[PDB]
Scaffold this active site. Structure first.
Site, short mmCIF file in Angstrom:
data_model
loop_
_atom_site.label_atom_id
_atom_site.label_comp_id
_atom_site.label_asym_id
_atom_site.label_seq_id
_atom_site.Cartn_x
_atom_site.Cartn_y
_atom_site.Cartn_z
N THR B 268 -9.06 -1.12 -10.46
CA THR B 268 -9.42 -0.65 -9.13
C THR B 268 -8.69 0.64 -8.78
OG1 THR B 268 -7.74 -2.14 -8.28
CG2 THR B 268 -10.01 -2.92 -8.31
N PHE B 393 -8.55 -4.35 0.91
CA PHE B 393 -7.59 -5.09 0.09
C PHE B 393 -7.65 -6.59 0.33
CE2 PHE B 393 -5.80 -0.79 0.12
CZ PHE B 393 -5.55 -0.61 -1.23
N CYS B 400 -4.37 -8.23 -1.29
CA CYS B 400 -3.84 -7.58 -2.48
C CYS B 400 -2.32 -7.51 -2.40
CB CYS B 400 -4.43 -6.18 -2.63
SG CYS B 400 -4.01 -5.35 -4.18
C1 HEM Z 1 -7.35 0.69 -4.80
C2 HEM Z 1 -6.78 -0.29 -5.51
C3 HEM Z 1 -7.01 -1.80 -5.23
C4 HEM Z 1 -7.97 -2.40 -4.50
C5 HEM Z 1 -9.15 -1.77 -3.74
C6 HEM Z 1 -7.72 -3.83 -4.55
C7 HEM Z 1 -8.47 -4.80 -3.94
C8 HEM Z 1 -8.13 -6.14 -3.84
C9 HEM Z 1 -8.82 -7.14 -3.06
C10 HEM Z 1 -10.07 -6.89 -2.20
C11 HEM Z 1 -8.19 -8.30 -3.22
C12 HEM Z 1 -8.61 -9.64 -2.56
C13 HEM Z 1 -9.48 -10.41 -3.54
C14 HEM Z 1 -10.06 -11.62 -2.87
O1 HEM Z 1 -9.72 -11.87 -1.68
O2 HEM Z 1 -10.88 -12.33 -3.51
C15 HEM Z 1 -7.07 -8.10 -4.11
C16 HEM Z 1 -6.16 -9.04 -4.53
C17 HEM Z 1 -5.20 -8.88 -5.52
N1 HEM Z 1 -4.85 -7.68 -6.11
FE1 HEM Z 1 -5.68 -5.88 -5.70
N2 HEM Z 1 -6.59 -4.06 -5.31
C18 HEM Z 1 -6.13 -2.83 -5.74
C19 HEM Z 1 -5.02 -2.63 -6.54
C20 HEM Z 1 -4.20 -3.60 -7.06
C21 HEM Z 1 -2.93 -3.38 -7.70
C22 HEM Z 1 -2.24 -2.01 -7.93
C23 HEM Z 1 -2.43 -4.55 -8.06
C24 HEM Z 1 -1.07 -4.69 -8.78
C25 HEM Z 1 -0.57 -5.89 -9.09
C26 HEM Z 1 -3.37 -5.60 -7.67
C27 HEM Z 1 -3.26 -6.96 -7.84
C28 HEM Z 1 -3.87 -7.92 -7.05
C29 HEM Z 1 -3.60 -9.35 -7.04
C30 HEM Z 1 -2.58 -10.09 -7.92
C31 HEM Z 1 -4.40 -9.92 -6.12
C32 HEM Z 1 -4.46 -11.42 -5.76
C33 HEM Z 1 -3.27 -11.80 -4.88
C34 HEM Z 1 -3.47 -13.18 -4.30
O3 HEM Z 1 -4.64 -13.64 -4.24
O4 HEM Z 1 -2.45 -13.81 -3.89
N3 HEM Z 1 -4.44 -4.97 -7.06
N4 HEM Z 1 -7.06 -6.76 -4.47
#
Ligand code: HEM
Ligand code: HEM
Lengths: 458, 461
Positions: B268, B393, B400
């Protein structure tokens, strides 16, 4: 009549050709020299030459009033893709004098001070690449050395970035060059070279030539996008006139010089760096001493011209590596008039004589009994070495025009290497010299532990 | 007043499947949302969901007392190679709470100041690569952004050097990831998933999984050669306990978290950087203003943490890119108990509802009439943005975890890019959003003319 010179076994109409039925013909000839002596005759279908291995005869062979440079068959076959380059022309043709007078200013000490910056650039690239490796990852020495030397010759002589470090594989130009050299070496062993069965090989050869030409085009084109920048080889080739005839190099000759310098300015230098690192990891006390000199002299983040010129032990180590295994291992000469070499071997006008540089460098009657030991201290007093006993760069006016270039670059790179890293022969590598006309260690791999010295930006 | 939910054309036993026979399903669903309205039902063989596109309903969907995060089929299929990662576990299960409490300290502001050095290392690598190009050479934007984000996530979270810049081809891990993600996206659209013609595809899938595992092993091995160094996510995974239950993560869960973070912390983010550069080269005045702010703030050869935090216009540009095209474009929720969404649509216990983030970010009743315009200045006053109107996010506890990480890294990289270069859209690139579950511009190429500004050094210990 009774012949005066020994000659190895002949095989009928094949003459001495079956004696070179190996991948290492230069080392095979070294063995023949060990068997027969200083000078011996060698016949192949259509040609006859005499191999010299001792200072006694070679000091007379280097007398330019009696002998002149000859184009041995290897050079005549390289002409197919290098044209009438500086290295592939008779000393008495107009092309050689013209190109020599045009290109010699490009290797003055002022041009060296100019090229120093770009050399440091590529060296910084290599050091950083080695610094960024993971644990339990080895270094393929010959491969990275070819990367560095190719990038350096490109950037310095043509203001063109090959970016060999941004490729996990060897550059296509390098692969085509190696293929062309292997084809030349095999063609030298063909009894019937016009046999149709070889057509396939010949075809592949042409493909490689294509690659070369393509690269040349890009380089020329790239110049037209940037313009005259450094006083590099390209500036003197395009906008340079002969101080004698007042004529500049024609376009075809310019292309020939481009390919020639691209090939020459990196392969042998790669071999030199690989051999030097090999001997350093195989002689730990010499390694320690050169590392101490490196840490002593190189005090700034980036080394300067004066600092490179003050790396005396690095230069001695490089010269000893050149001694033990000259990357370009032989050169040919012909007798201008009838003469008597050494007062013992009569030669007629136009006879061919080839200098076997490794055996000249192993002449015990001049060097001692420790000829096979890597002892750079023997270059302590340079005048103590007899004349014409150490000829890794040729002789006379037809000597290596980039000798200063090569030595400066190799000194800089090796100094930085021993400053920023500590090397380990993690495999007990047994030396294996692979031959593509030139010599280079194949399979040499080491590990490097960083001394964690910062390399800033300048 | 209970309304009847809209639904696009059904095709017999295939239900609404024939409407999504494209490589860009999220964009097709966006068009369906533009046609039918805020909420519409969508049925696929075996599953039924309800797509939401308005702030009015999404603010109720984000009510954590009524709805919880659901694992839509995309996540269930990603579990085949990501296991029970942090993003692929139900909120109510012990796994999520344990892994969250163990891994949350790795994203504190102090850990960010720690990661800053390695981020600058990879950024310098990228800038140096672009400076060393010849004349009349273009830049493959998505490829270099993937290089940067992968190298950064590796170096920062596992102290492992991918050296993506020392390869003229994409790293094999990236290739296997993209192939697996495309396989998931296509498998979700297959009428006959067990047809023999797809068998080969399945086989390839398994091979890719092998690659993933191999990489994981290397990382573990590399640590055992170096030791506890940068106190990364790996340190917390191996030598980290739950402040509540006192348990450390087991080995299988550690491998799952490794793969999950390796994919998430770079795909992403690569998309974000590509989209932002696109919008900048397509709106030259915003480009100029951000370049000027970059030249004002970044005065040292290498930027510092405070300098990155002082690039407000870069942050606004990144947020506007996030608004127009959220790289992760949707997330799913389920109703804890029976309820009435919007006062008009009855939902039973456990019904599925998915948030269509691009359409939420295009709700004119919240953003204005210029929803389709790239105007980052709309993020000037952050309190002026209504609640639950901007969810790139995620939402709630399942948001996120590396949002700060992604924003900091992207801000730093974009600032350095705009400081050291001037860009030219030498092809008048027409936008084409490629989808492999995530969104990213494909075919975007530009030329860069260096401002010939010197760059400093880095120790690399
Ligand atoms: C522009 C960059 C990014 C966008 C747009 C993005 C978007 C998202 C979104 C929408 C979710 C929620 C998913 C859901 O609710 O089903 C999420 C969760 C998550 N993201 Fe990102 N993300 C980005 C970058 C990153 C980065 C840099 C990491 C580094 C570790 C990451 C790791 C995670 C993790 C582990 C989750 C799940 C956390 C949990 O559910 O407790 N993402 N992200
Ligand atoms: C360790 C590195 C090198 C070694 C051992 C080496 C060796 C030699 C030798 C033995 C010759 C004479 C060949 C003959 O007389 O038949 C020669 C000539 C030549 N060398 Fe090198 N060389 C090296 C590096 C370079 C470099 C860096 C350049 C860069 C331009 C270069 C360019 C040339 C050229 C153009 C000639 C032919 C000049 C003429 O005959 O007028 N060489 N070299």
């Amino acid at each position: 009549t009774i012949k005066e010179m020994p000659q190895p076994k002949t095989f009928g109409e094949l003459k001495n050709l079956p004696l070179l039925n190996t991948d290492k013909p230069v080392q095979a000839l070294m063995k023949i020299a060990d068997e027969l002596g200083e000078i011996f005759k060698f016949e192949m279908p259509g040609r006859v030459t005499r191999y010299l291995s001792s200072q006694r005869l070679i000091k007379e062979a280097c007398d330019e009033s009696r002998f002149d440079k000859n184009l041995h068959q290897a050079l005549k076959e390289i002409r197919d893709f290098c044209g009438d380059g500086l290295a592939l022309v008779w000393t008495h043709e107009k092309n050689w004098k013209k190109a020599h007078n045009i290109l010699l200013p490009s290797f003055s000490q002022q041009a060296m001070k100019g090229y120093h910056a770009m050399m440091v650039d590529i060296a910084v690239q290599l050091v950083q690449k080695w610094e960024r490796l993971n644990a339990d990852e080895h270094i393929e020495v010959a491969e990275d050395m070819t990367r560095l030397t190719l990038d350096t010759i490109g950037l310095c002589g043509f203001n063109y970035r090959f970016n060999s470090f941004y490729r996990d594989q060897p550059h296509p130009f390098v692969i085509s060059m190696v293929r062309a050299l292997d084809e030349v070496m095999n063609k030298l062993q063909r009894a019937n070279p016009d046999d149709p069965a070889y057509d396939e090989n010949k075809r592949q050869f042409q493909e490689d030539i294509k690659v070369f030409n393509d690269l040349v085009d890009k380089i020329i084109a790239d110049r037209k996008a940037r313009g005259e920048q450094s006083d590099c080889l390209l500036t003197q080739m395009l906008n340079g006139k002969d101080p004698e005839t007042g004529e500049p190099l024609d376009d075809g000759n310019i292309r020939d010089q481009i390919i020639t310098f691209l090939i020459a300015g990196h392969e042998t230098l790669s071999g030199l760096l690989s051999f030097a690192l090999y001997f350093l990891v195989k002689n730990p006390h010499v390694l320690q001493k050169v590392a101490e000199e490196a840490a002593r002299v190189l005090v700034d983040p980036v080394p300067s011209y004066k600092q490179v010129k003050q790396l005396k032990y690095v230069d001695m180590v490089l010269n000893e590596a050149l001694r033990l295994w000259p990357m370009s291992p032989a050169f040919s000469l012909y007798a201008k008039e009838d003469t008597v070499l050494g007062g013992e071997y009569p030669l007629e006008k136009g006879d061919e004589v080839m200098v076997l540089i490794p055996q000249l460098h192993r002449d015990k009657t001049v060097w001692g009994d420790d000829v096979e030991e890597f002892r750079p201290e023997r270059f302590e007093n340079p005048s103590a070495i007899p004349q014409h006993a150490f000829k890794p760069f040729g002789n006379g006016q037809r000597a290596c025009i980039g000798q200063q270039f090569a030595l400066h670059e190799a000194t800089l790179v090796l100094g930085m290497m021993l400053k920023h890293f500590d090397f380990e022969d993690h495999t007990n590598y047994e030396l294996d010299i692979k031959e593509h006309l030139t010599l280079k260690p194949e399979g040499f791999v080491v590990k490097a532990k960083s001394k964690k010295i910062p390399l800033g930006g300048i």
